[PDB]
RNA sequence: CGCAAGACGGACCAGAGCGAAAGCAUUUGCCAAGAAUGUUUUCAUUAAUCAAGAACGAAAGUCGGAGGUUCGAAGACGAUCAGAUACCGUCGUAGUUCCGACCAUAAACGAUGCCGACCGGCGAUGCGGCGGCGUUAUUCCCAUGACCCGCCGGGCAGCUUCCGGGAAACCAAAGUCUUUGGGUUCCGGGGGGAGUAUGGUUGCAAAGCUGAAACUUAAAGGAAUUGACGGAAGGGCACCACC
RNA sequence: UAAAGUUGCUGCAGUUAAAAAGCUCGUAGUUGGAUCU
């Protein structure tokens, strides 16, 4: 992606799955980019900001997209620990 | 029977990476397995691993960063000279930019780039990319 | 003119999708060829690889239709392949051109040795498969050209690959499977996780989210 | 699963497994001290004993071999260690 | 011809041939 | 599967040498029976004396008389 | 046979959905209104449409039919969709709870609740259908 | 090409199954492969039940039944219409007919 | 929830859950729903941990709120048990409902009258709403589902562990999802109970509507 | 009503079990063997696969000795057929049964070598073990046997497969394959000629094992798709069909 | 000779296209678990 001169020569940088760290292909139409709303610590209202998790279609098909999103939310404090 | 425990370890790591798992349990452990894993981890492919000590032959739980495409063994361990190393890299590696051949040399177990740095040929153990 | 039927088409027509790489980044499907006509435009050069007449046996005789294999792509990193079967050759060619436009994928180019200038070859060894036809692309040194059969050579030149090494196995005489395997190998270039792509992904807003207000303002 | 932890398994999940398939193998057997009304000394008896154990203080058998755990006779108190 | 019957015919040919050869 | 051992060279060599005899071209070119049955005897050309002229009928799908000579 | 084709069936459905006000139960009145409110280019087809309109009017006088979406029956159905009881069906003074769900609630930090009555667990583990 | 995964028989984990004879043709057919019908039929047909019941010496006699186990070869079972040919997908349905 | 005291589940919520029987699952257990159940009763019924249910409901509410246009959220129910609840949720929240038969090609066939391209997709039952779930894998459509113990988790990105069989439980689950979405948005507060009672979402069969009137 | 002969072991009998395969089903007793399970027992690499050699090996067949019910190659008749000396029927010889000695071949098939790792889910089932509410049986103090709900190990199977692979049919193996190397044996190289000729070797024989070539040919073949056809099924229809 | 990954060590294939020995022992051959700074 970087030549010896240091200039970037890639067409684009593809997304990587937030669970498997695998590249999501340009024609992977089963992949998702879910936004999870962030909430105020004392009011519990939408902050206008969110957190994004990209799950590829292979994880969705095998059914571990739910567990992957749950673990990503748990490891981020959106979902309460234990 | 089970021969070449390194082949089993590398096949288990490859299969667990294909399945998208975060950890793989390898058994039995061995010195060569630990050295191969250390060479893998120095290059950022595999991450930290823990050696479980049962009193007969250890097991290793290896964390898996999703960076690994394929890890394989070469059987038999052909003796490789420094002049035949380039042919092995062309046969085994996806490109000249990334990918490593792990040799076992009298200077230790290391990748082909280090083996050329230390001016040592050896016996081919495997590869990873 | 062109009245978009999809949200993505409406966003593309109202000049707020900067490049085709945003859609590739978010893996959205293209259902209107006018998006590709808008982005790649006159740089696209298509050609017909093969017109295969296929017959269906009936009581009165054989019903003949013609399948058109069309490869398209600007010679700079985008290539597509479309196959359409119709009762007539002209209709099949038009449909195959539309399908090849809809199937355009980004092609990742790399270097063989030292990284000087623009990337010229494939970033690594890639393999494409389509019904026993295996096509392998190997990085080649600068100035080698495409060392391949005419069909993979045409697809790779359309993809903008300057020089490559090729291996084929299986019944490559079936042009459709050969071309589809070459297309699969070409599209696998951007799905391959190389160490230069290990940097953690930084997410940007989707076109549907970043321009939701414009979509609802209609 | 796709993220099950193997380094720190639950204790129930390790007692569930085969003794050889555990993270560190451990027997399912144990030794017991069995008291008999006809004696006072210490008689440590293997839980899976393959022999007919006889109390030296009486004509009473302590346990009988079985396909698995030994069958302790009714009227004997056994305390398991470790 | 059925393969079993072809084999039977060949075997009868061989039987006659070994009959004539001593 | 095939044997992969550092001391399997003899087995691989002998197996290849035995399996080459199941190749039609190899058996034809190395058995020497096709050489003795060749009228030219390994030569590219030959000189003969025309015994008679013969016309051989073409194979079934098309009809003709092929002008040959028995030499 | 006397099977009505898609033409008369669809025409009757549209006529009933759009002019349910005027149509009745009599063939003659349905015939007259069908002739008035539609351009039916044949009299046999007009009569067939009017007959199926009468049949469907009898059908809908006895309940809702899926092909027609008249506004009165839709209003009645939507009114039925807003029915709300005086007291919520979930406002039970006592909720019968098994011992295991009570232990779960204890682990859920809800163990002081007095609405819950602990029921005797069923001593039979016979919950699967016999095989065969 | 393999038509059935079980090869048209019910033999797993054994080499040989004893043959039986088809009830129609007396063909030697393996017991696992053979099509078996268990017929539990009244000795007195339903048309004759009333006439036999009236002529009965004993009141409330409940007439006996017939228990005959039928073994069929594939040819005779198909011809007798006990079984029929099915589609490639419906072939896999092992549920007996609901009747 | 994020362990915030404001987003914690109250006693009233647990009362509603227990009255509706939400914690009671089925006799079968999908291997991907094992992390959501608590134990199996002596009669084979799996008990759904209401902590995990509340957590997943709040996560789904966050996901729905993150969709800027409420109409881009699609709520689906082919079963009549969740149909009226889906219409009520759409009315209260602003989502686009599909109650009844889901026409195949609704998400994939652009040349079609009832063609829509939602940004989120919520279903009452993955096993019963398998058609929209399958089509969501063609258009990059994330999916939230109400899943029982035996529900399959293919194409389900946020599974809310709950009894989706009983009418009371389905209505309560949809009502709580709507209430949490509204509370996270800002409309209606969480300091006093919501004015809409859960029974507005409950399914009423013809016998029940005839008996009540 | 009995009597006598041989043959066989129905129903129970299952996509159930055992055996290396062939194969194995009436009771009881004897003899030796065996897998799995359990084991905080012992030895401590003793192992895997295997040229050469060796044991077993359906049926039919051969040579002796018994036996010879039933069925039955050959054969003899009787039969609608244009024509059986075929299919059908009545008989019927070797065989079919047992005891020795040969024979070593089967679509001997899962048309899938063996040993070892890893890779999804679920419900069963056979065996052993472990745990547990309760229900039933031997005097009212317990195990235990039959159920019930589970866990572990081996086994016969029932599985999508967009894990994955294949030409597909399909296969949780026929996966972990151009991202190609765990170990090892056998074995194929377009179709015919041909498993033929010849040599050797085994056998009483029948035959078995090893096993060509000249010549000939552009295809043969595998999976599937549409149609056509079927003295194939299901459902309908027609006085150019019948009744 | 390359094309022939149609002799395949790299690098073929053996369910149905040609193909795994009927089965099991077995000597040579090939291969062989952890562990020493």
GROMACS .gro file of C-alpha atoms in nm, chain H:
model
   99
  737UNK     CA    1  -2.504  -4.306  -0.974
  738UNK     CA    2  -2.620  -4.393  -0.622
  739UNK     CA    3  -2.999  -4.385  -0.604
  740UNK     CA    4  -3.030  -4.447  -0.229
  741UNK     CA    5  -2.793  -4.386   0.060
  742UNK     CA    6  -2.891  -4.717   0.224
  743UNK     CA    7  -2.875  -4.906  -0.111
  744UNK     CA    8  -3.246  -4.990  -0.088
  745UNK     CA    9  -3.196  -5.206   0.222
  746UNK     CA   10  -3.166  -5.163   0.599
  747UNK     CA   11  -2.825  -5.326   0.657
  748UNK     CA   12  -2.568  -5.133   0.861
  749UNK     CA   13  -2.276  -5.279   1.051
  750UNK     CA   14  -2.318  -5.636   0.929
  751UNK     CA   15  -2.209  -5.841   0.631
  752UNK     CA   16  -2.483  -6.094   0.558
  753UNK     CA   17  -2.859  -6.097   0.617
  754UNK     CA   18  -3.058  -6.418   0.589
  755UNK     CA   19  -3.287  -6.431   0.284
  756UNK     CA   20  -3.661  -6.488   0.284
  757UNK     CA   21  -3.911  -6.575   0.011
  758UNK     CA   22  -4.148  -6.325  -0.146
  759UNK     CA   23  -4.507  -6.420  -0.067
  760UNK     CA   24  -4.606  -6.373  -0.433
  761UNK     CA   25  -4.326  -6.515  -0.649
  762UNK     CA   26  -4.109  -6.699  -0.391
  763UNK     CA   27  -3.810  -6.484  -0.486
  764UNK     CA   28  -3.510  -6.501  -0.254
  765UNK     CA   29  -3.495  -6.149  -0.109
  766UNK     CA   30  -3.286  -6.040   0.192
  767UNK     CA   31  -3.491  -5.981   0.504
  768UNK     CA   32  -3.363  -5.625   0.552
  769UNK     CA   33  -3.433  -5.534   0.187
  770UNK     CA   34  -3.773  -5.704   0.172
  771UNK     CA   35  -4.091  -5.502   0.211
  772UNK     CA   36  -4.286  -5.630   0.511
  773UNK     CA   37  -4.659  -5.591   0.570
  774UNK     CA   38  -4.826  -5.704   0.893
  775UNK     CA   39  -5.194  -5.765   0.818
  776UNK     CA   40  -5.428  -5.788   1.117
  777UNK     CA   41  -5.762  -5.865   0.951
  778UNK     CA   42  -6.088  -6.002   1.085
  779UNK     CA   43  -6.151  -6.363   0.989
  780UNK     CA   44  -6.511  -6.264   0.911
  781UNK     CA   45  -6.537  -5.989   0.651
  782UNK     CA   46  -6.734  -5.678   0.742
  783UNK     CA   47  -7.016  -5.772   0.503
  784UNK     CA   48  -7.059  -6.112   0.672
  785UNK     CA   49  -7.010  -5.991   1.031
  786UNK     CA   50  -7.380  -5.939   1.102
  787UNK     CA   51  -7.490  -6.272   0.952
  788UNK     CA   52  -7.225  -6.466   1.144
  789UNK     CA   53  -7.306  -6.276   1.464
  790UNK     CA   54  -7.675  -6.368   1.449
  791UNK     CA   55  -7.601  -6.736   1.385
  792UNK     CA   56  -7.364  -6.739   1.684
  793UNK     CA   57  -7.437  -6.983   1.966
  794UNK     CA   58  -7.262  -6.755   2.217
  795UNK     CA   59  -7.374  -6.397   2.270
  796UNK     CA   60  -7.089  -6.143   2.258
  797UNK     CA   61  -6.836  -6.375   2.095
  798UNK     CA   62  -6.602  -6.108   1.945
  799UNK     CA   63  -6.477  -6.284   1.632
  800UNK     CA   64  -6.105  -6.366   1.596
  801UNK     CA   65  -5.858  -6.184   1.371
  802UNK     CA   66  -5.602  -6.298   1.115
  803UNK     CA   67  -5.231  -6.227   1.169
  804UNK     CA   68  -5.029  -6.273   0.849
  805UNK     CA   69  -4.683  -6.125   0.792
  806UNK     CA   70  -4.628  -6.049   0.423
  807UNK     CA   71  -4.283  -6.042   0.264
  808UNK     CA   72  -4.244  -5.886  -0.081
  809UNK     CA   73  -3.971  -5.853  -0.337
  810UNK     CA   74  -3.931  -5.509  -0.493
  811UNK     CA   75  -4.089  -5.618  -0.822
  812UNK     CA   76  -4.398  -5.774  -0.664
  813UNK     CA   77  -4.436  -5.494  -0.409
  814UNK     CA   78  -4.428  -5.234  -0.688
  815UNK     CA   79  -4.668  -5.434  -0.906
  816UNK     CA   80  -4.912  -5.491  -0.619
  817UNK     CA   81  -4.902  -5.112  -0.556
  818UNK     CA   82  -4.803  -5.158  -0.192
  819UNK     CA   83  -4.520  -4.915  -0.266
  820UNK     CA   84  -4.496  -4.662  -0.547
  821UNK     CA   85  -4.211  -4.478  -0.712
  822UNK     CA   86  -4.151  -4.136  -0.559
  823UNK     CA   87  -3.969  -3.818  -0.652
  824UNK     CA   88  -3.600  -3.771  -0.578
  825UNK     CA   89  -3.697  -3.555  -0.279
  826UNK     CA   90  -3.998  -3.752  -0.150
  827UNK     CA   91  -3.796  -4.075  -0.165
  828UNK     CA   92  -3.624  -3.972   0.159
  829UNK     CA   93  -3.952  -3.961   0.353
  830UNK     CA   94  -3.945  -4.261   0.587
  831UNK     CA   95  -4.270  -4.182   0.769
  832UNK     CA   96  -4.528  -4.458   0.713
  833UNK     CA   97  -4.845  -4.348   0.530
  834UNK     CA   98  -5.088  -4.183   0.774
  835UNK     CA   99  -5.374  -4.393   0.628
   0.00000   0.00000   0.00000
